[PDB]
Amino acid sequence: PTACREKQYLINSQCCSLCQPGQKLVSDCTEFTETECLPCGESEFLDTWNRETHCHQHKYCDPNLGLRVQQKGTSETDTICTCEEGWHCTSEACESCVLHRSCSPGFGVKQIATGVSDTICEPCPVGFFSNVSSAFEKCHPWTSCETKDLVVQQKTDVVC
Amino acid sequence: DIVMTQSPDSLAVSLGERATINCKSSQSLLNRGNQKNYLTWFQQKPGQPPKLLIYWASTRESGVPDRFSGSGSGTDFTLTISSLQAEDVAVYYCQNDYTYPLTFGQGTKLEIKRTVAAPSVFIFPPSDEQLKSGTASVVCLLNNFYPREAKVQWKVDNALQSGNSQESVTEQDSKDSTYSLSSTLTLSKADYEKHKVYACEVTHQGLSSPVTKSFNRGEC
Amino acid sequence: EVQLVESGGGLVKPGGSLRLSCAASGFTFSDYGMNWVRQAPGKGLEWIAYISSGRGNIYYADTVKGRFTISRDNAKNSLYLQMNSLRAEDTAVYYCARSWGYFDVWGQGTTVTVSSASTKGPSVFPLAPSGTAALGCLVKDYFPEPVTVSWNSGALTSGVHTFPAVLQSSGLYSLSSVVTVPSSSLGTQTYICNVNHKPSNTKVDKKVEPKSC
């Protein structure tokens, strides 16, 4: 005898409309007036069908950290950063830039980098693993548990 | 650094036909978040800041005539001007609007093809005031002609001139689509005073025969 | 109205310094990102600097990195460009442009010439007449670009062609400005080309009357 869509939310017994990605909320929808939204600021954003009344601050890609802009900040997405031709993002979040490489899942760090030696990676043996790419983490070992339901590869842990 | 290569560099299109300007980017201009291609189109008229035409590759800015249609996606984009008008003569730029540094295409000079129009030719003697400075500028004006190809020839007492002339052109007219041309023969006062008959001989597709404007030094 | 009015351009010696201003009006300057785009003479458009609307985020083209610093004054409604350690490739028209995702309002354009050479006002010489007649003005030997030519103070526009300036061996600029007028209006109507060269603060008004032999 009633419904509620996926781009709507429930408030005050009425099913109101969420603001589209990029628009913030100004006031809530009533019986006879719908939700009023407003676009974000030139320097702001919002990822989602939302009901927030403030937008998010845009990511700055700082050159003093070696950061370039990979994709511009738009109303509906955040600024994406990356690094110069020979550099690496420290993590996926790419907060700054490094020259040292990181071992990928399946490998662990034998030797953290120093001076002009790059990080030294070895493959994880039986039974050790690495589920992340990292410049610091070595292979940690699998749980030696009771009910072995799934075996472990190397880059995943024994799930029991 | 993303690189926009427009195509062609120059384009000559008849009045009321369709103009196609292509643009290719070294990278994808596609934002996965909002499914928009960040490709902007601009129209820059002679000595004027660019006017914005189309953004997000196909959204016509408010005010712009619907003849101007942006399209394309991925790496290949296209600007289409249907039913071309005389006021559409300008350089057109595609811009990467996807990331910094914001990079423009190298431009596409659009010319309007009209019917053949013949120049009106005028000649001007060098003023007595300029002769004190020791040089004589003889100017020849070709007024309101199409196409650009026009041949001025300078004769000094019927002897053909070489190297001492410079031609300069106006921008194709926003209303009547014609060119204007000045040809300036630069001579020393001594050399100017040594000869008598100064003549400008002009040929153009729209003329039947050469047109010669002349004047005699000292006579008038 | 929606306006952007540059100022500050001109001639400056290499290594010298310049500060362009941009006077915003007719919209809420705070709400917008601001940019500088330049255009080398006879060349294309080049984006050089950007300042965001909020935290005031700043990006440059690599070619001005270090030397040029973009800034704003929301309180005074103005965008600014500190150019330092100027090279000859910095000679261009500098375009102010607002942005809310895309450039949509641009400035007048202001010319910046980086040159060792010195300012010179023009000599204005008459191109005198002999249905329609043609007269003009020969604007010669000035530096740097631009001059601007009008006729009868702007009260004459029909038929006026002002050709682009040409650089000569002398290192000085020359151009002609011509106008077509009925040959009847020749003893009656008086014609004056108004040559204004702001770089040297010269204004020349030359009156072109036919030559009587």
For residue C106, which of C115, C93, C97, C94 has the smallest C-alpha distance?
C97
Give the integer Cα–Cα distance in Å for B105 and B96: 8
Structure-block tokens of residue B108: 């596409």
Determined by X-ray
The 10 Å Cβ neighbour count of residue C188 is 6
Residues B20, B25, B26, B27, Cα dihedral to 10°: -140
Q: Which CATH architecture does the domain made up of B114-220 adopt? A: Sandwich (2.60)
| CB nearest to C54's CB, from A43, A61, A63 | A43
Q: Is C114 helix (H, G, I), strand (E, B) or coil?
A: strand
Q: Are C120 and C143 in contact (CB under 8 A)?
A: yes
B124 and C175: CB-CB below 8 Å?
no
Q: Are B189 and B131 in contact (CB under 8 A)?
A: yes
Question: What's the gap between Cα C2 and its chain centre?
Answer: 20
Give the integer Cα–Cα distance in Å for B168 and B141: 10
Give the integer Cα–Cα distance in Å for C4 and A22: 28
Region of residue C109 (phi > 0: left; psi between -120 and 50: alpha; otherwise: beta) = left
For residue B105, which of B22, B171, B18, B11 has the smallest C-alpha distance?
B22
Give the integer Cα–Cα distance in Å for A75 and A80: 13
For residue B127, which of C127, A16, C116 has the smallest C-alpha distance?
C127
Q: Are B18 and B117 in contact (CB under 8 A)?
A: no
Do A6 and A52 belong to one domain? yes
Structure-block tokens of residue C153: 């103070």
Give every CB contact of residue B49 below 8 A, 6+ residues apart in sequence: C95, C106, C107, C108, C109
Q: Are B170 and B148 in contact (CB under 8 A)?
A: no
Do A84 and A52 belong to one domain? yes
Beta-ladder partners of B121: B142
Q: Nearest CA to CA, how far is C30 from chain A (Å)? A: 10
Do C96 and C184 belong to one domain? no
Domain that holds residue A12: 1-89
Do A105 and A55 belong to one domain? no
C59 and A43: CB-CB below 8 Å?
no
| CB nearest to B137's CB, from C46, C102, C138 | C138
How many structural domains is chain C composed of?
A: 2
Query: Domain segments of chain B: what residues?
Result: 1-113, 114-220
Do C110 and C18 belong to one domain? yes
For residue B213, which of B124, B127, B130 has the smallest C-alpha distance?
B124
The 10 Å Cβ neighbour count of residue B83 is 13
Structure-block tokens of residue C200: 């040297």
Q: Are B199 and B213 in contact (CB under 8 A)?
A: yes
DSSP letters, C68-98, are: EEEEEETTTTEEEEEE-S--GGG-EEEEEEE
End-of-domain residue from the set A89, A117, A134: A89
Q: Could you give the C-alpha distances from B53 to B8, B12, B94, C17, in angstroms and in order?
A: 19, 20, 10, 35
Contacts of C128 in chain B (CB under 8 A): 124, 127
Structure-block tokens of residue C112: 């910046």
Question: What's the gap between Cα C113 and its chain centre?
Answer: 10
Give the integer Cα–Cα distance in Å for B183 and B201: 11
End-of-domain residue from the set C116, C147, C163: C116
Structure-block tokens of residue A142: 């699998």
Structure-block tokens of residue B204: 């153009």
Do A6 and A71 belong to one domain? yes
3-state secondary structure A6-70: CCEEEECCEEEECECCCEEEEECCCCCCCCEEEECCCCEECCCCECCCCCEECCCCCHHHCEEEE
The matching CATH number, chosen from 2.60.40.2470, 2.60.40.10, 3.30.70.3270, 3.40.50.300, for B1-113 is 2.60.40.10
Contacts of A68 in chain B (CB under 8 A): 100
**Is residue A58 less than 8 Å (CB to CB) from chain C?**
yes
Do A13 and A83 belong to one domain? yes
Give every CB contact of residue C8 below 8 A, 6+ residues apart in sequence: C18, C19, C20, C21, C81, C110
* DSSP-derived secondary structure letter, A102: -
**Is residue B34 less than 8 Å (CB to CB) from chain A?**
yes
Q: What is the CATH number of the domain that holds A18?
A: 2.10.50.10
Q: Nearest CA to CA, how far is A131 from chain B (Å)? A: 27
Do C5 and C100 belong to one domain? yes
Q: What is the CATH number of the domain that holds C138?
A: 2.60.40.10
Amino acid at C28: T
Structure-block tokens of residue C3: 């306006």
Q: For strand B179-188 and strand B165-169, is the pairing parallel, antiparallel, or unpaired? A: antiparallel
Do A2 and A56 belong to one domain? yes
End-of-domain residue from the set C91, C116, C141: C116
Question: What's the gap between Cα B141 and its chain centre?
Answer: 17
> At what resolution in Å was this solved?
2.8
Domain that holds residue C18: 1-116
DSSP letters, C180-191, are: EEESSTTSSS-E
A72 and B98: CB-CB below 8 Å?
yes
Question: What's the gap between Cα C106 and its chain centre?
Answer: 14
Give the integer Cα–Cα distance in Å for B190 and B133: 11
**In chain C, which residue's Cα lies nearest the Cα of B62?**
C104
Contacts of A76 in chain C (CB under 8 A): none
Q: Are C143 and C119 in contact (CB under 8 A)?
A: yes
Do C83 and C37 belong to one domain? yes
How many structural domains is chain A composed of?
A: 2
Do C5 and C62 belong to one domain? yes
Do C88 and C4 belong to one domain? yes
Do C205 and C185 belong to one domain? yes
Q: Are A119 and A111 in contact (CB under 8 A)?
A: yes
Structure-block tokens of residue C116: 């060792």
Do A95 and A85 belong to one domain? no
Scan for tokens 């003005």, then name that residue.
C137
Give the integer Cα–Cα distance in Å for B88 and B136: 39
3-state secondary structure chain B: CCCEEEECCEEEEECCCCEEEEEEECCCCEECCCCEECEEEEEECCCCCCEEEEECCCEECCCCCCCEEEEEECCEEEEEECCCCHHHCCEEEEEECCCCCCCECCCEEEEEECCCECCEEEEECCCHHHHHCCEEEEEEEEEEEECCCEEEEEEECCEECCCCEEEEECCCCCCCCCEEEEEEEEEEHHHHHHCCEEEEEEEECCCCCCEEEEEECCCC
Do A58 and A26 belong to one domain? yes
For residue B94, which of B23, B158, B143 has the smallest C-alpha distance?
B23
Give the integer Cα–Cα distance in Å for C166 and C7: 25
- Which B residues in the span 56-115 are in contact with C, Cβ-Cβ below 8 Å? 61, 93, 95, 97, 100-107
Give the integer Cα–Cα distance in Å for C33 and B153: 54
**Which residues of C touch chain A, with CB atoms under 8 Å apart?**
31-33, 52-55, 57, 59, 65, 99-101
Q: Which residues in chain A have their C atom more than 2.5 Å from the N of the next written residue, marking a break after them? A: 154
For residue B90, which of B50, B146, B44, B147 has the smallest C-alpha distance?
B44
